[PDB]
Amino acid sequence: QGANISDQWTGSELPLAFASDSNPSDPVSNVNDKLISYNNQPANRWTNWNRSNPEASVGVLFGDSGILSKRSVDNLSVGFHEDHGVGAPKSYVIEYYVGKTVPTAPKNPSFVGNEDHVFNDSANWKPVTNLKAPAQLKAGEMNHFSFDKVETYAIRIRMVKADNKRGTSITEVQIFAKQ
Ligand SMILES: CC(=O)N[C@@H]1[C@@H](O)[C@H](O[C@@H]2O[C@H](CO)[C@H](O)[C@H](O)[C@H]2O)[C@@H](CO)O[C@H]1O
Numbered sequence: 001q002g003a004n005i006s007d008q009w010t011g012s013e014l015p016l017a018f019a020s021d022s023n024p025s026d027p028v029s030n031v032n033d034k035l036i037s038y039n040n041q042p043a044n045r046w047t048n049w050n051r052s053n054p055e056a057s058v059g060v061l062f063g064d065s066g067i068l069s070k071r072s073v074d075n076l077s078v079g080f081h082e083d084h085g086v087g088a089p090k091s092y093v094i095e096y097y098v099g100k101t102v103p104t105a106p107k108n109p110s111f112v113g114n115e116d117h118v119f120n121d122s123a124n125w126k127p128v129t130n131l132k133a134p135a136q137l138k139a140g141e142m143n144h145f146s147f148d149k150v151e152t153y154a155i156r157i158r159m160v161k162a163d164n165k166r167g168t169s170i171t172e173v174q175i176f177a178k179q
């Protein structure tokens, strides 16, 4: 297992977690802060609980030594959280950035859908290929995904909430460079 290329680094803008939208008290910066909690002691999670769109994406924009960098990516791990109102999503696509335009850091990363940004244009994304995933997603553990290696500025997971919940919930993601 190589470098963790998703963790926040102190005094560095990158790498940076981003989301299309969020529950304001559950900001998307929670998914790469190296805290993992499946309860409220402490509560630590991104969610879109009680937001208007049932679908939302969460992603990592990559960095090397403080500045923007393409990374070679073939994996993703997601720790889904559940309670009475949030849970793992009923469906998901895992996508990577292909835009010719070099992406900038969003101004408000927890709510990328609310500003003009390359991430909001679906022509800038393609699905990963030859995905290996769990047969069923589970809250309460890191769910591991792998796929064909790609050189990208960013990957995201785009998710629709389960019908019996008010949002999707993630305590932490982790992405690793090749050994
Ligand atoms: C008693 C009551 O309804 N309290 C609510 C809280 O549930 C709510 O917090 C959110 O709850 C959802 C539960 O699925 C999830 O845990 C979210 O992460 C969390 O923010 C709060 C919203 O600020 O309002 C209270 O009314």
Ligand SMILES: [Ca+2]
Pocket (backbone or CB within 6 Å): 030, 031, 032, 033, 034, 035, 036, 037, 044, 045, 171, 172
């Ligand atoms: Ca976390």
